Write a protein that holds these residues in place. Structure first.
Motif, PDB file in Angstrom:
ATOM      1  N   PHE A   1      -7.981   0.383  -0.676  1.00 27.06           N
ATOM      2  CA  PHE A   1      -7.357  -0.678   0.098  1.00 27.06           C
ATOM      3  C   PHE A   1      -8.045  -0.826   1.449  1.00 27.06           C
ATOM      4  O   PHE A   1      -8.605   0.133   1.989  1.00 27.06           O
ATOM      5  CB  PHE A   1      -5.863  -0.411   0.312  1.00 27.06           C
ATOM      6  CG  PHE A   1      -5.016  -0.709  -0.890  1.00 27.06           C
ATOM      7  CD1 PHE A   1      -4.539  -1.989  -1.115  1.00 27.06           C
ATOM      8  CD2 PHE A   1      -4.697   0.289  -1.794  1.00 27.06           C
ATOM      9  CE1 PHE A   1      -3.759  -2.269  -2.219  1.00 27.06           C
ATOM     10  CE2 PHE A   1      -3.916   0.016  -2.900  1.00 27.06           C
ATOM     11  CZ  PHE A   1      -3.447  -1.265  -3.113  1.00 27.06           C
ATOM     12  N   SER A   2      -7.993  -2.041   1.987  1.00 23.29           N
ATOM     13  CA  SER A   2      -8.553  -2.330   3.296  1.00 23.29           C
ATOM     14  C   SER A   2      -7.535  -2.003   4.388  1.00 23.29           C
ATOM     15  O   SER A   2      -6.475  -1.422   4.137  1.00 23.29           O
ATOM     16  CB  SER A   2      -8.996  -3.789   3.374  1.00 23.29           C
ATOM     17  OG  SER A   2      -7.901  -4.666   3.170  1.00 23.29           O
TER      18      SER A   2
ATOM     19  N   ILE B   1       0.857  -1.180   0.000  1.00 24.80           N
ATOM     20  CA  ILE B   1       0.000   0.000   0.000  1.00 24.80           C
ATOM     21  C   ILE B   1       0.895   1.233   0.000  1.00 24.80           C
ATOM     22  O   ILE B   1       1.550   1.538   1.003  1.00 24.80           O
ATOM     23  CB  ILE B   1      -0.954   0.006   1.202  1.00 24.80           C
ATOM     24  CG1 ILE B   1      -1.842  -1.239   1.186  1.00 24.80           C
ATOM     25  CG2 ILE B   1      -1.801   1.270   1.204  1.00 24.80           C
ATOM     26  CD1 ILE B   1      -2.800  -1.321   2.355  1.00 24.80           C
TER      27      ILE B   1
ATOM     28  N   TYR C   1       3.059   1.612  14.158  1.00 26.18           N
ATOM     29  CA  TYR C   1       2.655   0.265  14.526  1.00 26.18           C
ATOM     30  C   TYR C   1       3.264  -0.123  15.867  1.00 26.18           C
ATOM     31  O   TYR C   1       4.399   0.241  16.185  1.00 26.18           O
ATOM     32  CB  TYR C   1       3.073  -0.743  13.453  1.00 26.18           C
ATOM     33  CG  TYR C   1       2.491  -0.463  12.086  1.00 26.18           C
ATOM     34  CD1 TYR C   1       1.250  -0.969  11.720  1.00 26.18           C
ATOM     35  CD2 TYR C   1       3.182   0.306  11.159  1.00 26.18           C
ATOM     36  CE1 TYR C   1       0.715  -0.715  10.471  1.00 26.18           C
ATOM     37  CE2 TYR C   1       2.655   0.565   9.908  1.00 26.18           C
ATOM     38  CZ  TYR C   1       1.420   0.052   9.570  1.00 26.18           C
ATOM     39  OH  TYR C   1       0.892   0.307   8.325  1.00 26.18           O
TER      40      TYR C   1
ATOM     41  N   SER D   1      -3.005   3.461  -3.464  1.00 27.09           N
ATOM     42  CA  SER D   1      -4.148   3.814  -2.630  1.00 27.09           C
ATOM     43  C   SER D   1      -4.993   4.908  -3.270  1.00 27.09           C
ATOM     44  O   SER D   1      -6.212   4.947  -3.066  1.00 27.09           O
ATOM     45  CB  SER D   1      -3.679   4.250  -1.242  1.00 27.09           C
ATOM     46  OG  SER D   1      -4.779   4.588  -0.416  1.00 27.09           O
TER      47      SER D   1
ATOM     48  N   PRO E   1      -4.568  -2.686   7.048  1.00 28.09           N
ATOM     49  CA  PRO E   1      -3.424  -3.601   6.988  1.00 28.09           C
ATOM     50  C   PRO E   1      -3.562  -4.737   7.988  1.00 28.09           C
ATOM     51  O   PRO E   1      -4.191  -4.600   9.040  1.00 28.09           O
ATOM     52  CB  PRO E   1      -2.229  -2.702   7.331  1.00 28.09           C
ATOM     53  CG  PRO E   1      -2.714  -1.301   7.101  1.00 28.09           C
ATOM     54  CD  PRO E   1      -4.169  -1.326   7.443  1.00 28.09           C
TER      55      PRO E   1
ATOM     56  N   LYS F   1      -5.390   5.624   7.891  1.00 30.56           N
ATOM     57  CA  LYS F   1      -4.254   4.716   7.923  1.00 30.56           C
ATOM     58  C   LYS F   1      -3.380   5.012   9.139  1.00 30.56           C
ATOM     59  O   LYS F   1      -3.128   6.180   9.456  1.00 30.56           O
ATOM     60  CB  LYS F   1      -3.433   4.839   6.641  1.00 30.56           C
ATOM     61  CG  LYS F   1      -4.209   4.514   5.376  1.00 30.56           C
ATOM     62  CD  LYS F   1      -4.715   3.081   5.388  1.00 30.56           C
ATOM     63  CE  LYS F   1      -5.469   2.751   4.111  1.00 30.56           C
ATOM     64  NZ  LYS F   1      -4.615   2.921   2.903  1.00 30.56           N
ATOM     65  N   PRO F   2      -2.910   3.984   9.842  1.00 24.16           N
ATOM     66  CA  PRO F   2      -2.083   4.220  11.030  1.00 24.16           C
ATOM     67  C   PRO F   2      -0.745   4.844  10.671  1.00 24.16           C
ATOM     68  O   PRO F   2      -0.168   4.579   9.614  1.00 24.16           O
ATOM     69  CB  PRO F   2      -1.898   2.817  11.623  1.00 24.16           C
ATOM     70  CG  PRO F   2      -2.996   1.991  11.020  1.00 24.16           C
ATOM     71  CD  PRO F   2      -3.211   2.556   9.652  1.00 24.16           C
TER      72      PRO F   2
END
Lengths: 49, 50
Positions: A16-17, A6, B36, A11, A19, B32-33
């Motif tokens: 996209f879903s 991604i 992590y 994107s 992660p 989106k993060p």
């Protein structure tokens, strides 16, 4: 589905879903033989001692 | 809490170390993060005095 990455362009062009696994860039090198530290006779003590 | 205040119309955005799970994402959308991480256990140093 698979191991698709991604990024910004993908994107922006394809939805996209969320992660499910961590990925990134990492350099891989061969094992390099290390060297012993000099003055090893002073290791099991301290200079103050 | 913070999510309850967000849903009540107090604020519009949240900038805080909020994790992502099913129950909270069923009501609001998560982007989106940016970092992590995971869950672990923290204990004290043993330091044996034998």
């Amino acid at each position: 589905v698979g191991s698709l990455t991604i990024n910004e362009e993908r994107s922006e062009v394809v939805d996209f879903s969320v992660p499910f696994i961590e990925t990134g860039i990492s350099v891989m090198v061969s094992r390099s033989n290390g060297t012993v530290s000099p003055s090893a006779f002073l290791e099991p003590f301290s200079a103050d001692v | 809490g913070m999510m309850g205040e967000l849903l009540s119309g107090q604020a519009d955005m949240i900038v805080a170390p909020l994790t992502i799970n099913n129950e909270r994402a069923q009501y609001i959308e998560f982007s989106k993060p940016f970092k992590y991480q995971g869950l672990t256990i923290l204990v004290k140093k043993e330091i044996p005095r034998s």
